[PDB]
C-alpha cells in the first residue's frame, strides 16, 4: 500500500476507479483534455501490491479574489479511494502528501467541490461561495419600470448557436472572471468541452441555444424530461444593461413555464421584477472551498474595504502560525508575532471568510471564531465585506 | 360605494368577508383577541348600499430598528375586497385613505405581511426581512468541537409542557425583540393566542412542547401528516450558548428524521454541524414589508455603522421629499433641499435598505436605486449594514 | 442524576415524558390502563436534581412458545430518555436495573417491540418474529378450488359491530394465543383499549367493523385517506376453515380495491387463490424480540421437534454460561460444564431461534453462531424449528 | 389453424412475434445466440392459413436440487399468443404438445419464469423459488463485530472491468450452481449476452463494474435515472467470508444512498449489519416454476434431510399417478402401488415443495396438500426441507 506519482502506466487504472467513483465522468477521449491543466507532480495514486486504489491530483487554475487579484491556485479534483479500501486513512495520507507539494511549490491557496458537506472541513478547506437556485415563473414575470432596456425600438440580443461565436464567449467570460471574486481563466481544452456538452446526445440532453449581448451571453437548454423547464447552464454579463437584457430574452421563453438557473445570492434578477417573489430560491449549496496555503502571503494579496478606518490586531490560526494582522487603505500587512492572540480561528473559518461570502459575526456566534472584542468582529466583517458580490465560476 | 370607519354593526359583515378571504381565520372568539390591537379609527371598510365588500385596519405595534431603536408602527393587516368587487380600485381607495389616517396620526413607518408578492410595492411598501427555511437531517447531525455546551455534566435545557412556563417565555422573548432588528412587542392577548395553538387540536395539529433554558426558548410539534418531521415553530435565543444548547436538544429528538425551521439568512446553526451542508434551505421569502411614512423622522431614528467614516450626500425618494443626509458617529441628520440629488429610489426601496436586509448594491444593479458615483453605493452599502442580524418577529 | 422507582409524584413528569417521546401515545386517562400490567417495582426514572429525563419498566406478560408452553415474560416497554439527556449512558443504565430486577423476579424472558432496529441486540435482545405486509387487488383474487368453504349454502361469516361481540372475541383470540408461539394474553384493559380504537374519532380512523366465524374473527376499517384500502387491524382464525371464511368474506369487500394486513411469512393466504401473486407483500419487519434471562431454564421450557435424532453438544453463550445440551423425544436438558464448547453465540442470538423464526444455518453463514461441526447446525436447525408457525401477538 | 415444428421460414414471424410480445426483446442478433440453447422438436408454431399467431419452445438446462444433484430440466420460454387469436385455447394446445414432447425425450421436469402469476398453475407448474429484494441504507450500514473479513491488512476483492475477467466470473457461478438448489448451467452464449450488457448503452443502462474475490463476484450498476441507488444484477458468493468480503465492497460505494439486490429468504446480509433493519424487504415474488414431468423419477433423483428417521406413505398425484414413498438415509423409494392414498396433491403443489421453497404445512393449511395425519406433514416438512437454502440462477 505505497503512495506514487502515477506513471503512463497506472492511468487507465485511475480512469476505471474515476468511472467507478464519478457518475459524471466523461470518458477518456474527455480526461486527456483536462490532463493538460494537472502540472508534472500534480497526481498522487495509492497501488495494492497492482491495481489503483486511491488518487488525488490538482490542476494549476487562477482566481480572481477581492480588488481583482488573481492568484495561482492549487484546484483539488479527481480524489477517489476504491469502496475496498475505506477506513484505511488513504484520503489523510493523499490530502497530506498533495498539501506538502501545493505548499513547496509556492500556491497561496488550494480549492475544491465537495462532493460532501462534511468530509474536506478537517483537512482545512472552507465553504467560500454560496450556489442558489432561482427559479422563475415565466408566465408571471412583469419587468419593473426601473428595469433598464425597456424602451421601444430594436434589442441587442441575438439568438445563435453556441458552436458559431465561442471567441466572444471567451471575451466576455474573460473580461467577467478578471473583475469577480470567485473568477476562474477557463483555459481552452475546457471551451473544448464547454461545446461539445452544447450539442444535443442521442437520448441525452437536448441543444444548447445561446443569448448573446455585446457585454453578456446566456447558455441554456430545455430539460431532458421537464419540457416547460430551461435551465440556464451558464450566465455571465460584466454590465447591468447586459444583465438585465439577457434576462429580458430569457423571460421571453413563451414555451416554457419555468426558468432555472444556479446563481448567487446577490443576484439582482428578483429587483427587476413588478413580483420579488417569482424568483424563487429552490436549492442553496456550498460552491468553491478554499485551502488558506499560506496565511500572511494570502492576507497581503487581497485588497479590503476601504470604507473602514485603520485597525491592529493578532490573528492566530490553529496550527497555521500567528500574524500581526494590520489593515487600512484597503490593503493588509502581516506579519510573524509570538503577542497574545486577540481572535483564535481554524484554518478552514479564514478560507470561508477569505472572499466574503460568509460574515465574521456569523462564524463568532456558532464559536468557529473566538474573539473577546465585539468591535474588533465587526472591524473583520466590515473588512473582509467583498464590495463586487463573490460569484462560482465552473465546478472541477 | 362609500369609505368609512365600521360601525358596531359592520363588524359580523367584516368577519364573513374574512373567513372566506383568509383561510387561516380562526373565528369572531378570537378576532375580539387582535381587535384590541387596533385604536380607535384604525379601521375603514366598503359598504355597497348594505353588505361589507372591502375592509382593511392598522394595529398599534413596537418595531425594533438597528440601534435597538423601538419605533411606532402601524400594522397594516386583515385587508380584503370581496371577490364580487375587483379591479373596481378599492384596495387603492382603502390604502390611500388608513395611509393619510397612519401619517396624521404620527407613525414614521408602517409594515406588512404580504399574501402576494407583486401587489404592495406600488403602495410604497419594500421586502424588509427574509424568511429562510432550514431543514436538517438530524440523523447524520455531529457538533463541531468549536460548538458551545458539549462538556460532559447536567444539561441546562428542561423539555416543559407551553402553557405551565408562560411567564419565562415572555421574559425572553421581550429581551429578544428589544435587541433584534425586526423584533416587535409581543402583548398579552398574542401570548392568549399562542398557547391556545401549542394544544392538539381534534384532527388538527399535535401537541407542542418546549425546550426552555435561563436565555432562549423553542417551540416546536410533530407535523400533523409527517411523523418523522419535527416543525420549530419559535426559537428566541438571547446568548449564543443557550442558541447552541437549544439545537443540541433539538438534534437530541431521536425518533425524528428532518427538524424543520422558518430562521433568517444569518441564523449561525449550520456553522455549528461538522456538515454544514446537512442544514439544507429548503424554502426563502419575503418577511416583513415596511412603507417608509416620514423619510427624515425614520432615517433620523436608526443607527448606523460606526465603521464607515462621516459622509453627505443628497437622497431623492419619487414623490416623498429630497434631503441633504449627513451620516457619520452611526447617526444620521436629515434636512429639506433642493440641491441637485446625487442618489434617487421609489419609497419602497427604502423600506427594503432600512432593516440592513437588502445591499443598496444589489438594488442599484437593477436600478431600483440611481447614483452616478459608485463610492457613495458603497458609503450607503456600509452605513445601512446592521451589526446584528435583522430577523422576523412574528406574522400579523 | 440518580436512579429510583417513581413515586406518585413521578408520574405526571413521566406523562409528559411519553407525549414527547412517543407520537402514537394516548394520554393520561389511557395510560392508567396499562399502569395495571406493571408490577410493583417494575419502573425506573432518572431525575436530574427535578423533572423525569429518563424512564424504563416492564409488564408482567404470558408467552406462548413451542410446545404450547406458557412463559412468565418481562415486557420491556415505555423506555425513554429526554432529547436534552441522549448520549449520557441513562439507558444503559436503567435497562442493566430493569434486567437485574426480572432476573431476581425470575422471569426467564423479557420481550419488547424495537422503534429501531439497532439499539437493543448490544443488551442481549434478538428478533424472534417477523412482521408481513400482504396487500390483496381483491378485484382479480378467484379462490382456488381446493380452498374450503366454497359450497352452496350459507356462510357461517357474520359482520358485525366489533363492541357487541367482545366476548367471542376475547374466546377465540384465548384458544388462539395458547396454541401459538409468540401468542400473549390478553387482560381485561387490553380488550378495554382495542374497542375504545373501534369506533370512528372525529378528523382520526374511520369506523371498525367485524367479520365473526365460531372459530376466527377480522377487524378492520377503511384507510383514513385511501377509500379503496381496508386495513385488517387484527385476524385470529384457529382452524384453517375459519381463516379461508374470513378471507372469502374479505375478497367479498366489493367497493374496496385493496385489503392490507400485517401477518407472519407462513400465513398461507396466497395459496387459497388461484394466483399466489395476488397477495403481495408490501413491508416487513422484526416482530417481537427476546432477551432469554435465564440460558437453562428457557431452553429446557419449550418443546423441540420430535422428527431430528437424540443429540448432545456444548454451547457457550458470550457472559451467559456454557452448557450441556442434550436434545431427544422433543424435550432438552440443559446442566452447567466447563466441557470445551462446540458452539458460541452472544445472548441475542439465541433469543431469535428460540421461536424458530431464524435458522442457525442462516446466523452460522453470518458468523453471529460459530461451530466447526455442520452436522450440529443441521440438527439445532432441525430441533429449534417450530411445527406450528410463530406469529406476533400485539405490540407493546 | 395447424400446430407443427418451425421451419427456417416461420423465425422472421416468430421474431416479430416476440418484439410484440416481450418488451425485454433483445432482437435477432441476439436470439441467434439462446436459439443454440433449443434443441431440435424443441419448439411449436400455430400459423393462421400465413402469420405465426402462437409460438412455444423449451431450452435444454441442468437444475441443481437438493442434495446436489443436476437434473436435465425443458426449460419452458418465448410462449407467446398474438393479440389478434386470445381465447382460443393457443395456449392449451402449445402447452400440451411441448409437454407430450419433453415427457417422450425423458425430461423429470420442466421449469419457467411466469410473467403472471395465475397462468401456469392449471398446467401443472408451482413456484419452487422465491425471489427477494433487499434494499440497504448504506450511510447507516455498520458491519457487527461477529461478521467476517474486519481486521487490518489489505482487502481481497478488487474493483475491475467484468469483459476482462470472464474466467474468474465463469469458474466462480460454475462452482456456485452445483452446489445451491436452483442453480442451472450457464452455456458460452449466456456468459456472451451477460457481457454485451455490462457495457453503457447510448441513453439505456449505466456501466457495470465488477467486484472480485477468489470463491465470490458481484456485478452492480448505477440506476439509470436514481444516481444515488447501486443495483447488484448478480453476486455469487461460494463461502461465507466471499459473501461477507463482498458486502463490505459494496456498503463502501460512498457516493451511493442505496444498494438494491434481488436475492433469496434465507440471505444472510441483514445478520452482518449491527441493525438487522437496515436491510429493508422492499419487494418478493415468485422465481423459477417446476412442472414434475414423472414423479417417481424425480422424487427419486433428489436427496431428503438425514435428520427425520425413516417412514413411508402413499401419495396420490391428481391424474399423475400413486406412488408408494419410502424416505430413509436422505434417499427416496418411489414405486406404483393402489394401496388407500394417504396424501394427495395437484401436481403443482409437488414442484412448489420440490426444492424446500414451500413447506407442506403451509400447502396443507390452504388444503392444496390433503392427509388426516399431521405426524406425516411434520415428516414430509422435516425431508423435503433443504439444508443448503434454493436459490434463483438466471431467468429464462
Ligand atoms: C486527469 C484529469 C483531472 C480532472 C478531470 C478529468 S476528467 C474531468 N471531468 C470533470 S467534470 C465536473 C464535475 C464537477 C464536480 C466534480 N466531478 C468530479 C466532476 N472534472 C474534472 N476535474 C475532470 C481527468
Ligand atoms: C380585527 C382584528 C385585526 C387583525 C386580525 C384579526 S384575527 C387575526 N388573525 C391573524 S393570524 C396571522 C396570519 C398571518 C398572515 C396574514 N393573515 C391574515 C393571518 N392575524 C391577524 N392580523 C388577525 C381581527
Ligand atoms: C405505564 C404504562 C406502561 C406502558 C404503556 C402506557 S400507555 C401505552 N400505550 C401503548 S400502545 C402500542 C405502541 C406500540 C409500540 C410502542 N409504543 C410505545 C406504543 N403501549 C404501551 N406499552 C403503553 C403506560
Ligand atoms: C429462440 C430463442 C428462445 C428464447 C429466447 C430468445 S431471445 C431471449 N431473451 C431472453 S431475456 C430474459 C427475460 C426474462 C423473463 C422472460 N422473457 C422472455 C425474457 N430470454 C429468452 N428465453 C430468450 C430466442
Ligand atoms: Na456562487
Ligand atoms: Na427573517
Ligand atoms: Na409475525
Ligand atoms: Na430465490
Redesign the interface.
Known sequence: ?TLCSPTEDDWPGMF??A?????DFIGPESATAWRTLVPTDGAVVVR??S?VVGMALYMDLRLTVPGEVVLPTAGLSFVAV?????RRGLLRAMCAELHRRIADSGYPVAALH?????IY?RFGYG?ATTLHELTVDRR?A?F?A???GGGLGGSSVRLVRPTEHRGEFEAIYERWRQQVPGGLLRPQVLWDELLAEAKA????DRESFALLHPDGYALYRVDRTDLKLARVSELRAVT?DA??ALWRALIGLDSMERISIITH??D?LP????????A??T????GLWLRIMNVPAALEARGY?????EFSTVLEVSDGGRFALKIGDGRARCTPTDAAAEIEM?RDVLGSLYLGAH?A???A????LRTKDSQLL??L??AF?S?V?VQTAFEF
Open positions: 500500500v476505471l476507479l468511472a467507478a467513483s464519478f457518475t495494492d501490491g491495481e476504491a469502496p475496498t479500501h475505506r465537495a462532493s460532501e458537506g462534511g472541513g465553504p408571471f412583469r419593473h426601473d428595469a433598464p446526445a442521442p437520448g441525452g447591468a444583465h438585465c445570492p446577490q439582482p429587483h427587476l421584477l413588478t413580483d420579488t417573489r417569482l424563487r430560491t436549492w442553496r449549496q456550498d474595504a476601504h470604507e473602514v478606518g481554524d460574515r459575526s456569523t462564524l456566534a456558532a464559536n468557529r465587526r472591524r466583517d466590515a465585506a464590495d458580490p
